[PDB]
Coordinates of C-alpha atoms and ligand atoms in Angstrom, one line a residue:
X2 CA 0.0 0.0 0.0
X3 CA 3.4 2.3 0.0
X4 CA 3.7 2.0 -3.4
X5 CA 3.2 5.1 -5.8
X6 CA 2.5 6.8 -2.9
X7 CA 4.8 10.2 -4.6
X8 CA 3.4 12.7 -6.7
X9 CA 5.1 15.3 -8.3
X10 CA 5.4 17.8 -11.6
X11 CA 8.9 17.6 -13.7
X12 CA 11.5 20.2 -12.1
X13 CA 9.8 20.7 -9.0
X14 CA 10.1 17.7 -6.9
X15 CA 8.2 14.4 -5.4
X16 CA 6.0 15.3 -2.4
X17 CA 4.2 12.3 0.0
X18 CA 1.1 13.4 1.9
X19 CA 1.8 13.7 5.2
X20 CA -0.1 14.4 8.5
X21 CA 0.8 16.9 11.2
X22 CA -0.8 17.7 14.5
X23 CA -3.6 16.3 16.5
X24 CA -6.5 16.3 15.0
X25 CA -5.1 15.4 11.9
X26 CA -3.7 18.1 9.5
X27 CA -2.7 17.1 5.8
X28 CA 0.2 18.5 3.5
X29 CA 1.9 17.0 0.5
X30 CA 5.8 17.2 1.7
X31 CA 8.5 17.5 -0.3
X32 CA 10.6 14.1 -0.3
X33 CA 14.3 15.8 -0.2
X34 CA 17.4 13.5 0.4
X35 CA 19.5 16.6 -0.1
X36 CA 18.4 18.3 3.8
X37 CA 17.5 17.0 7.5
X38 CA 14.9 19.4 8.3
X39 CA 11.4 18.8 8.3
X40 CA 9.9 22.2 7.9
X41 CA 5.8 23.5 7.0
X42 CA 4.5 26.2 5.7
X43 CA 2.7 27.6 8.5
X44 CA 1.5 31.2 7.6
X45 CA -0.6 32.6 4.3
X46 CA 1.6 32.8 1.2
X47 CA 0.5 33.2 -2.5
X48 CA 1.8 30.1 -3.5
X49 CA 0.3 27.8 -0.9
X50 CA -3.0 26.0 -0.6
X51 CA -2.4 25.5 2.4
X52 CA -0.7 25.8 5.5
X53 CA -0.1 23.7 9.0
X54 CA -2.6 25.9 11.5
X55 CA -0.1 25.6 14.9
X56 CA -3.5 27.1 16.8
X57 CA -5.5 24.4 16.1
X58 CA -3.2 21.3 17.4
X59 CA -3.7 20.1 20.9
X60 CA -0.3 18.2 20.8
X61 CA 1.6 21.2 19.5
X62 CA 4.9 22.2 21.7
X63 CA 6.5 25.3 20.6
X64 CA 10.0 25.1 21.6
X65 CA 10.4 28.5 21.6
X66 CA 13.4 29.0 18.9
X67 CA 14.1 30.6 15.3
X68 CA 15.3 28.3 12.4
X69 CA 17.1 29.7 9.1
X70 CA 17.4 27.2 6.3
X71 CA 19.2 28.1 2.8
X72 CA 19.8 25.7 -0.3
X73 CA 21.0 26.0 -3.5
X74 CA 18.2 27.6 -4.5
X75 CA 15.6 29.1 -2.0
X76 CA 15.8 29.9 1.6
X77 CA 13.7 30.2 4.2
X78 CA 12.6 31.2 8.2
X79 CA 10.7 29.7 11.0
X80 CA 9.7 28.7 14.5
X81 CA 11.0 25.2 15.9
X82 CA 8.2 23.3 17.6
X83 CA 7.3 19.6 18.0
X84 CA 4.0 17.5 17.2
X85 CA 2.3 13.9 16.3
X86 CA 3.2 13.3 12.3
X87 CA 1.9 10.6 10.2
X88 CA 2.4 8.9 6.7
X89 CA -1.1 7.7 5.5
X90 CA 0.3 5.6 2.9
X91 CA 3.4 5.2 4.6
X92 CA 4.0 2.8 7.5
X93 CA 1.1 3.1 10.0
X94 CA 2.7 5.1 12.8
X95 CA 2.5 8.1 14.6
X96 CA 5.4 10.0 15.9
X97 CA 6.4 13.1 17.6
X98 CA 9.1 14.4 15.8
X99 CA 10.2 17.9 15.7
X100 CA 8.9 20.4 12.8
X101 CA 9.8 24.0 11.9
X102 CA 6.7 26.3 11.3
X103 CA 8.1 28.3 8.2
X104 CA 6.5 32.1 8.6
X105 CA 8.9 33.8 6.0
X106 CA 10.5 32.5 3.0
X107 CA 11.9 33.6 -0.4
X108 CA 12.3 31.8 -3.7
X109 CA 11.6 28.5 -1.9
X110 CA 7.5 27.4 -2.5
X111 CA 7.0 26.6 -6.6
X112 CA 3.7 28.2 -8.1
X113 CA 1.6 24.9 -8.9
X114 CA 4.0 22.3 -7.1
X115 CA 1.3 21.3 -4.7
X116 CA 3.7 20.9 -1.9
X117 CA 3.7 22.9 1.4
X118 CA 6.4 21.6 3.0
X119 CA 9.7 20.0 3.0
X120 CA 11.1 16.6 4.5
X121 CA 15.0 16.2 4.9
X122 CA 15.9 12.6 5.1
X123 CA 19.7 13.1 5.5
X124 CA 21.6 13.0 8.9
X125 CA 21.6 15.1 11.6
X126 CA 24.4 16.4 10.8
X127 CA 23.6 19.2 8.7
X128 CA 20.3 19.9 10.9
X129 CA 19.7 23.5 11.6
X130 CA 20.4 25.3 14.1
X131 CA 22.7 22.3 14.9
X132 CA 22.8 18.4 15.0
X133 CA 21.1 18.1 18.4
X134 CA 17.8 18.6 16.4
X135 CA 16.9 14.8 15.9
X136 CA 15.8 14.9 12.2
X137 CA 12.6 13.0 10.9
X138 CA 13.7 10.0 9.9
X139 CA 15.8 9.7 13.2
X140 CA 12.7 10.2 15.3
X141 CA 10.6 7.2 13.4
X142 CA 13.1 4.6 14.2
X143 CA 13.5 5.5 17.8
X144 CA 9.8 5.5 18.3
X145 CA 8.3 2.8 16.1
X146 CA 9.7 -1.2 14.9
X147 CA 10.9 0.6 11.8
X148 CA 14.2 -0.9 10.1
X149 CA 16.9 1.5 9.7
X150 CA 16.5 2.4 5.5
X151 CA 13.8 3.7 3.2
X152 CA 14.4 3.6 -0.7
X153 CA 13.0 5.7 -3.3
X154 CA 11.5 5.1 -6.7
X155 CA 11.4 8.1 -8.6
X156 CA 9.4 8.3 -12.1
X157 CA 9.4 10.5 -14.9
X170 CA 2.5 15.1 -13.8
X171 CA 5.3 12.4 -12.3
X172 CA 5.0 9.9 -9.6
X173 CA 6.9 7.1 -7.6
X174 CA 7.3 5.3 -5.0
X175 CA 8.8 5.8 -1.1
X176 CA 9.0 2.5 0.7
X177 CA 9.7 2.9 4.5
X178 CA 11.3 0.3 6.4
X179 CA 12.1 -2.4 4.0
X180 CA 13.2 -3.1 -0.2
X181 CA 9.7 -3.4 -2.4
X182 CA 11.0 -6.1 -4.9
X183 CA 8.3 -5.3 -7.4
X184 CA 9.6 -1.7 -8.0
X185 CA 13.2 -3.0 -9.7
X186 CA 15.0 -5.8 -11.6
X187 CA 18.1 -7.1 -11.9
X188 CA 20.7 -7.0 -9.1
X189 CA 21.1 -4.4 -6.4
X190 CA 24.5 -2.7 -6.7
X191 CA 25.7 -0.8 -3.4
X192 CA 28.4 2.0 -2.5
X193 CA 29.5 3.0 0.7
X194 CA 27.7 6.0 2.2
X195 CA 31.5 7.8 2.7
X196 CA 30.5 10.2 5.8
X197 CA 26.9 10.4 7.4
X198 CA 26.2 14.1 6.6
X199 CA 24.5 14.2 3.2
X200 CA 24.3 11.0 1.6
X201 CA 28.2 10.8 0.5
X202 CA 29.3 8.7 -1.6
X203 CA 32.4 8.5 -4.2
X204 CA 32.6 8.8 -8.0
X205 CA 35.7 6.7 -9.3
X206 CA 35.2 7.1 -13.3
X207 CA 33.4 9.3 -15.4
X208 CA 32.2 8.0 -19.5
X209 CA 31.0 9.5 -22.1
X210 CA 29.5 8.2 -25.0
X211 CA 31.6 5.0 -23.8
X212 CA 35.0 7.2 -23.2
X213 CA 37.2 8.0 -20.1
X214 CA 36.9 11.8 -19.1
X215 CA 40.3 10.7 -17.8
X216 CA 40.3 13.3 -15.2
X217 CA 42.0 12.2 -11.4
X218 CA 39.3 10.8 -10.1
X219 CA 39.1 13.3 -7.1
X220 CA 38.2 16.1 -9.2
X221 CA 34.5 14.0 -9.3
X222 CA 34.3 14.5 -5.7
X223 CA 35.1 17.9 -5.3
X224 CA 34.1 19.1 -2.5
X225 CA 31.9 16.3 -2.1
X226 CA 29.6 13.9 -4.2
X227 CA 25.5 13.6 -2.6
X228 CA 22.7 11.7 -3.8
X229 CA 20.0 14.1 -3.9
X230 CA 16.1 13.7 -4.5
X231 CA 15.4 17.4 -3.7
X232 CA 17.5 18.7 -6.3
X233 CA 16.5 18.4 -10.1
X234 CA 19.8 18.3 -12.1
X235 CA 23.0 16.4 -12.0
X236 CA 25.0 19.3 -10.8
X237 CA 29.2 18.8 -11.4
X238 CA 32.1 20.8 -10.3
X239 CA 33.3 23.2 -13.0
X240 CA 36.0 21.3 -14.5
X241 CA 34.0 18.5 -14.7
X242 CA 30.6 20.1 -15.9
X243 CA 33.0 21.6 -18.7
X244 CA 34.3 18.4 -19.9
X245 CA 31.0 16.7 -19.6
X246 CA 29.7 19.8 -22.1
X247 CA 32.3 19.3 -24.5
X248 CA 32.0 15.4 -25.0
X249 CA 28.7 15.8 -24.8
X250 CA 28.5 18.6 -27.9
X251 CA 31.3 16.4 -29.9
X252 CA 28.6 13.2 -29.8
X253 CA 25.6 15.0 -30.7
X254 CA 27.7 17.3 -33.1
X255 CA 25.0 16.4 -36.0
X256 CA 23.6 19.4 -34.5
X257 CA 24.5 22.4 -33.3
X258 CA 22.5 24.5 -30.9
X259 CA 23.6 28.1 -28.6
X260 CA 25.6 28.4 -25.8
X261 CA 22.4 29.3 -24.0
X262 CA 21.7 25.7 -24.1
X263 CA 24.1 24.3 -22.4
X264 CA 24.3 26.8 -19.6
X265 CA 20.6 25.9 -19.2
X266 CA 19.1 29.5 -19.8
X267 CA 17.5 28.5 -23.2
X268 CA 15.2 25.0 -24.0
X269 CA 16.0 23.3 -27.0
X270 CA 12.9 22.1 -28.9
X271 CA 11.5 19.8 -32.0
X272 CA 8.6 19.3 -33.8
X273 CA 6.6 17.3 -31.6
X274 CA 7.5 13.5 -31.7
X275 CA 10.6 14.4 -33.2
X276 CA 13.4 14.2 -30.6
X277 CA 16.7 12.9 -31.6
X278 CA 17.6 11.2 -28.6
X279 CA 19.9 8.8 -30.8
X280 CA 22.5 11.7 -31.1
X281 CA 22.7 12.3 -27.3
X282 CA 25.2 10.1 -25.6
X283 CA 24.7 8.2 -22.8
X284 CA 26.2 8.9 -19.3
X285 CA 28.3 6.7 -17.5
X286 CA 29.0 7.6 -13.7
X287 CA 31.0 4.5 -11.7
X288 CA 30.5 4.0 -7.9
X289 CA 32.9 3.1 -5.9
X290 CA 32.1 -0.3 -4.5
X291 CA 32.0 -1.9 -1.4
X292 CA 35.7 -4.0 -2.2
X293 CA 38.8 -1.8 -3.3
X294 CA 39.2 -0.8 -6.0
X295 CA 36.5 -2.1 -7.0
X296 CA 33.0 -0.3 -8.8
X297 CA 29.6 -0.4 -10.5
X298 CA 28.0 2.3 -12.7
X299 CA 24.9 3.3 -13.3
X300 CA 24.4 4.6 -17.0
X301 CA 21.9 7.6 -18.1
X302 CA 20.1 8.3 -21.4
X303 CA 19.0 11.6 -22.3
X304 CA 15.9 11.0 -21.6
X305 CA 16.9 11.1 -18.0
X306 CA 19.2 14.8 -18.4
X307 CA 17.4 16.6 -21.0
X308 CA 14.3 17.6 -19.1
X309 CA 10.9 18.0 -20.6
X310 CA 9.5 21.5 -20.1
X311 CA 5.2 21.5 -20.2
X312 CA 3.7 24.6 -21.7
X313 CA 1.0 24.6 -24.1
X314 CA 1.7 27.2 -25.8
X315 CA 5.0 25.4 -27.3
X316 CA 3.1 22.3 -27.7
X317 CA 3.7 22.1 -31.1
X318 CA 7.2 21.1 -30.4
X319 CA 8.8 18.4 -27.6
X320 CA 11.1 21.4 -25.4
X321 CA 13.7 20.6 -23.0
X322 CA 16.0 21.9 -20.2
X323 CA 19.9 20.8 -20.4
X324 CA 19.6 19.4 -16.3
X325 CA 23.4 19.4 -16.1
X326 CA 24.4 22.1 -14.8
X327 CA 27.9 23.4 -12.7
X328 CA 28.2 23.3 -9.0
X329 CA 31.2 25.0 -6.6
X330 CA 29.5 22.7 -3.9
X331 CA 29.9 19.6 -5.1
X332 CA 28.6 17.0 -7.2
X333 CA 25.0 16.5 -6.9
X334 CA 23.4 13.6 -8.2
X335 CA 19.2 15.1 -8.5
X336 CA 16.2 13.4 -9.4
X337 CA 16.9 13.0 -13.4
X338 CA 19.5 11.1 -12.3
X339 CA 17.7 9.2 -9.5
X340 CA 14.9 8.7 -12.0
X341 CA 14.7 5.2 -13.5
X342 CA 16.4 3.8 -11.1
X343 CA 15.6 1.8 -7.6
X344 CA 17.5 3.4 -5.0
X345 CA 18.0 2.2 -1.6
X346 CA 19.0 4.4 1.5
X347 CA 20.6 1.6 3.5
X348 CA 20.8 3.6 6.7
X349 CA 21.3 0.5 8.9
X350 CA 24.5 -0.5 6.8
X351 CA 25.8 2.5 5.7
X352 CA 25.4 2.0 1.9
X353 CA 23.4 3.4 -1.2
X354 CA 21.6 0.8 -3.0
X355 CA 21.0 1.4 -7.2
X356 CA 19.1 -0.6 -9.5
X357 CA 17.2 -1.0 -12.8
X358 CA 14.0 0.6 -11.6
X359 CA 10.2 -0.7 -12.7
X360 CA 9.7 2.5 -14.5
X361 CA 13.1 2.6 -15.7
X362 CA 13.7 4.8 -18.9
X363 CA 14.4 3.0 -22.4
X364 CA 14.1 3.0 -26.1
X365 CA 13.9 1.1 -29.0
X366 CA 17.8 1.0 -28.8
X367 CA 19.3 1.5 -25.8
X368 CA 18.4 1.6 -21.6
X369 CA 19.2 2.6 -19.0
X370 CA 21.8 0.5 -16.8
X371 CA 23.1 -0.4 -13.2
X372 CA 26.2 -2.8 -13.8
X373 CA 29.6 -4.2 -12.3
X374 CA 31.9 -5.2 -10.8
X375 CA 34.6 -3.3 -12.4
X376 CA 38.2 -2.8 -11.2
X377 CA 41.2 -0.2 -11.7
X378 CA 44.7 -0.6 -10.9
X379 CA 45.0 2.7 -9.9
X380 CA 45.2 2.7 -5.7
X381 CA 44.2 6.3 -5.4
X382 CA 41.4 7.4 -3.1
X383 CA 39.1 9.0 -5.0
X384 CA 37.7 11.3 -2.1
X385 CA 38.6 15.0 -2.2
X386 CA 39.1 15.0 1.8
Ligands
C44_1 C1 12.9 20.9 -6.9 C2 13.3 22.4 -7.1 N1 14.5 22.5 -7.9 C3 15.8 22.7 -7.4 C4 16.1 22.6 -6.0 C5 17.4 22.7 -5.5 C6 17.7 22.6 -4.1 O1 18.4 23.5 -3.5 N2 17.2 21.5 -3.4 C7 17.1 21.5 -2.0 C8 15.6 21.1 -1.6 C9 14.6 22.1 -2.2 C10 14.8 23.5 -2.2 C11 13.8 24.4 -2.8 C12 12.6 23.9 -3.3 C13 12.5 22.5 -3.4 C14 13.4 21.6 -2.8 C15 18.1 20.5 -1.5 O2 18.0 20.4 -0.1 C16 19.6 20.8 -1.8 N3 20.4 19.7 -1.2 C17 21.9 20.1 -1.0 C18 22.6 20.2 -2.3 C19 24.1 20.6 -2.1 C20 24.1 22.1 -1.5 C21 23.1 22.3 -0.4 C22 23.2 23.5 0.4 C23 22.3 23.7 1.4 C24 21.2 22.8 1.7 C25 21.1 21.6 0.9 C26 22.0 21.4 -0.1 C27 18.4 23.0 -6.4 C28 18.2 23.1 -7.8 N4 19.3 23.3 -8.6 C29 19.7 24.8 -8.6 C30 18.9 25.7 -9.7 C31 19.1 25.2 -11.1 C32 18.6 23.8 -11.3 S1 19.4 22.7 -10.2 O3 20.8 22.6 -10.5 O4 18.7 21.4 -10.2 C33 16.9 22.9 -8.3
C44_2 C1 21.7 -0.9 -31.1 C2 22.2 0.3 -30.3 N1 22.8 -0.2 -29.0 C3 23.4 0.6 -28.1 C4 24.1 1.8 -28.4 C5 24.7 2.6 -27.3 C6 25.4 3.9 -27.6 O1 25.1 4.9 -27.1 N2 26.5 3.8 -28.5 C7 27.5 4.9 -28.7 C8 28.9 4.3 -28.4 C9 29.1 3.7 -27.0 C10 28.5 4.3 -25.8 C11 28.6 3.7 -24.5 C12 29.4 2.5 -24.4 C13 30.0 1.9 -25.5 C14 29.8 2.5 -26.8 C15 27.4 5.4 -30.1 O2 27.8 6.8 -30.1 C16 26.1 5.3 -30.8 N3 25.5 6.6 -31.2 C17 24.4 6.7 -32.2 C18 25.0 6.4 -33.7 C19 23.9 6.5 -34.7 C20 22.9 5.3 -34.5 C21 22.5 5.1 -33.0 C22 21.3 4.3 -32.7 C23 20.9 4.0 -31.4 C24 21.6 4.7 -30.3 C25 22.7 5.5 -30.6 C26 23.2 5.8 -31.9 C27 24.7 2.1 -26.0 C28 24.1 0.8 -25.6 N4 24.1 0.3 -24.3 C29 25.4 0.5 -23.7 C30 25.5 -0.1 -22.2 C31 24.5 0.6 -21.3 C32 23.1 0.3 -21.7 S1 22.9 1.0 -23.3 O3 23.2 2.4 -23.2 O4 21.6 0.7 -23.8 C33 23.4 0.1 -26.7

């Protein structure tokens, strides 16, 4: 009954429906990998339908404290309290966990995205104001029977699946690949090889993991360090060089569109990124078509063509691997054992031609650590 429990429009995240306070207040939550703070909106804003009403919850505790919370794109402000929370199509539990009331906020709720709030499901870590602020996840294992892991099936109006507490073998195939979660901040892990259209970027591996590498569900693109994200452009334009399109492209500031039906994936190349493994110097990759990084943009008034968004994009925090790269693919958030889980996913993404992949082992001779710290 957990599966394709997500909802979600292209570029603007997954949400679950969530309940908070006592009686019962429902909001679709933002699923975000990327953040440990469970936050609501909890005043009027244009962009919200609806809002978590503190007044009206018996079980409300204010614990009387300010929150600030920036990401890479949006920020926002509120009061820390604590209350009951449920997952109505999640596991059938009740916790209190704690929740930040969001009262001011900039460039953070989407018009249309029919979320109101946000749900980080990385460690506590990175919680704000510090890491003594149990995050969500955290609290549900302390308080219910739940296993240590979650997994997430993310699809490309998109849905998917969360699965609390267990691995839903319905929702991939193949085998299950894993790579060690590096440091229990984000979700860490290491990139040992990049390929392109089947060749070596032949870069030192660190420069992958520069600053860090995260697996990400609340951002949308495959973000990469500069030198990387160059590279990446240039063997990318050199495979698809049948065509030529502007600058503006690539630096994601213009869509690129064709007569409707009439996409050319065949001249985009796919997109090798290798794992490390859980043996030395040994790896798996996970391979992604441009169906998965060339994003589809809706708008009716274009809908005489197919338009996308280039979702690679540069980072100076890191490599982030988002949802069009988490899309396709099972992913498991083995909490318990400290690993990241990837395989072929149920709704994985193919053509005629080619598919996407999740394969191994492979080994290098190379003895380098390929983690920037
Ligand atoms: C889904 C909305 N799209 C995007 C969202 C984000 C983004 O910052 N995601 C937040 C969650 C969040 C924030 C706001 C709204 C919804 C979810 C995540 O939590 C970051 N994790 C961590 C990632 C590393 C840095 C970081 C710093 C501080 C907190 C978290 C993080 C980055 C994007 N991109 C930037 C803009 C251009 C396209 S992009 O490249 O996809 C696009
Ligand atoms: C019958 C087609 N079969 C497949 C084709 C490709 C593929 O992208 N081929 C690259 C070279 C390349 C890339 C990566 C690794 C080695 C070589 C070539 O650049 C084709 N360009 C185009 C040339 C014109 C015709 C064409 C037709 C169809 C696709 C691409 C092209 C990958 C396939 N698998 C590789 C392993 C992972 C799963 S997969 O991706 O499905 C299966």
């Amino acid at each position: 009954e957990m599966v394709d429990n997500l909802r979600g429009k292209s570029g603007q995240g997954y949400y679950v429906e969530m309940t908070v306070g006592s009686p019962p207040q429902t909001l679709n939550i933002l699923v975000d990998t990327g953040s440990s703070n469970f936050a609501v909106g909890a005043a009027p804003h244009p962009f919200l339908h609806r809002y978590y009403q503190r007044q009206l919850s018996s079980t409300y505790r204010d614990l009387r404290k300010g929150v600030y919370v920036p990401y890479t794109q949006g920020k926002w402000e509120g009061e820390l309290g604590t209350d009951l929370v449920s997952i109505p199509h999640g596991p059938q539990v009740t916790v209190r966990a704690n929740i930040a009331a969001i009262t001011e906020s900039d460039k953070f709720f989407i018009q249309g995205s029919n979320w109101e709030g946000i749900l980080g499901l990385a460690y506590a870590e990175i919680a704000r104001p510090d890491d003594s602020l149990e995050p969500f996840f955290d609290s549900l294992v302390k308080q219910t029977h739940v296993p240590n892991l979650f997994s997430l099936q993310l699809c490309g109006s998109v849905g998917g699946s969360m699965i609390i507490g267990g691995i839903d073998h319905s929702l991939y195939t193949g085998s299950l690949w894993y790579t060690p979660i590096r440091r229990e901040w984000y979700y860490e892990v290491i990139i040992v090889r990049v390929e392109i259209n089947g060749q070596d970027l032949k870069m030192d591996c660190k420069e992958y993991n520069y600053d860090k590498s995260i697996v990400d569900s609340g951002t949308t693109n495959l973000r990469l360090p500069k030198k990387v994200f160059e590279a990446a452009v240039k063997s990318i334009k050199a495979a698809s060089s049948t065509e030529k399109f502007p600058d503006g492209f690539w630096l994601g500031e213009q869509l690129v569109c064709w007569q409707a039906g009439t996409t050319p994936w065949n001249i985009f190349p796919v997109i090798s990124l290798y794992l490390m493994g859980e043996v030395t110097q040994q790896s798996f990759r996970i391979t992604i078509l441009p169906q998965q990084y060339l994003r589809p943009v809706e708008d009716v008034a274009t809908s005489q063509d197919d338009c996308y968004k280039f979702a690679i994009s540069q980072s100076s925090t890191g490599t982030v691997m988002g949802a069009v790269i988490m899309e396709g693919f099972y992913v498991v958030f083995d909490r318990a054992r400290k690993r990241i889980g990837f395989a072929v996913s149920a709704c994985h993404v193919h053509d005629e031609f080619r598919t996407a992949a999740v394969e191994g082992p492979f080994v290098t001779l190379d003895m380098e650590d390929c983690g920037y710290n």
